[PDB]
């Protein structure tokens, strides 16, 4: 919880819409079992975060999103939460 250890690359305008609390469903072609803080990375910057609370397209559900006062810079892991 709190700060995220992992971030998701999201292109604008979506990234912004997410961290400003305007977009609550991020669409993806795969599910994921990640839960909790999820950093939002766009244009090589960590601009904020959201809480991934639940989940041919899928809708990742975000809650409590907010934009950091100042965009953190960056500097990948393969999500294995859906492995069988």
């Amino acid at each position: 919880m709190e700060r995220p250890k992992l971030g998701l690359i999201v292109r604008e305008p979506y990234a912004s819409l997410i961290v400003d609390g305007r977009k609550v469903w991020e669409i993806r072609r795969r599910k994921t079992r990640h839960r909790g803080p999820l950093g939002i990375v766009s244009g090589g910057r960590l601009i904020g975060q959201a809480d991934l609370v639940g989940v041919p397209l899928y809708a990742w559900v975000l809650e409590n999103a907010f934009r950091y006062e100042k965009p953190l810079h960056v500097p990948m892991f393969v999500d294995l939460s859906e492995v069988r």
Side-chain angles (χ1 to χ4, degrees):
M1 205 165 249
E2 193 18 39
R3 252 47 176 180
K5 306 301 282 53
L6 310 159
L8 179 68
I9 296 77
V10 187
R11 342 244 61 275
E12 292 292 1
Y14 313 109
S16 286
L17 296 174
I18 285 166
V19 302
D20 295 320
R22 300 184 62 185
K23 171 175 179 52
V24 302
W25 274 26
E26 164 68 356
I27 304 300
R28 292 288 154 143
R29 307 164 72 60
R30 312 278 318 178
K31 285 189 313 194
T32 174
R33 216 165 313 198
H34 170 73
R35 285 303 175 311
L38 181 75
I40 302 299
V41 180
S42 190
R45 286 133 193 307
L46 188 57
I47 63 4
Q49 71 181 66
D51 286 330
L52 189 56
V53 298
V55 186
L57 312 170
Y58 294 115
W60 296 18
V61 178
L62 311 167
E63 292 202 338
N64 331 161
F66 68 83
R67 168 193 295 277
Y68 305 134
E69 58 171 5
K70 269 177 164 290
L72 305 189
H73 220 327
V74 180
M76 306 297 306
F77 287 133
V78 175
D79 177 18
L80 307 172
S81 59
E82 292 313 334
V83 176
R84 329 183 79 258

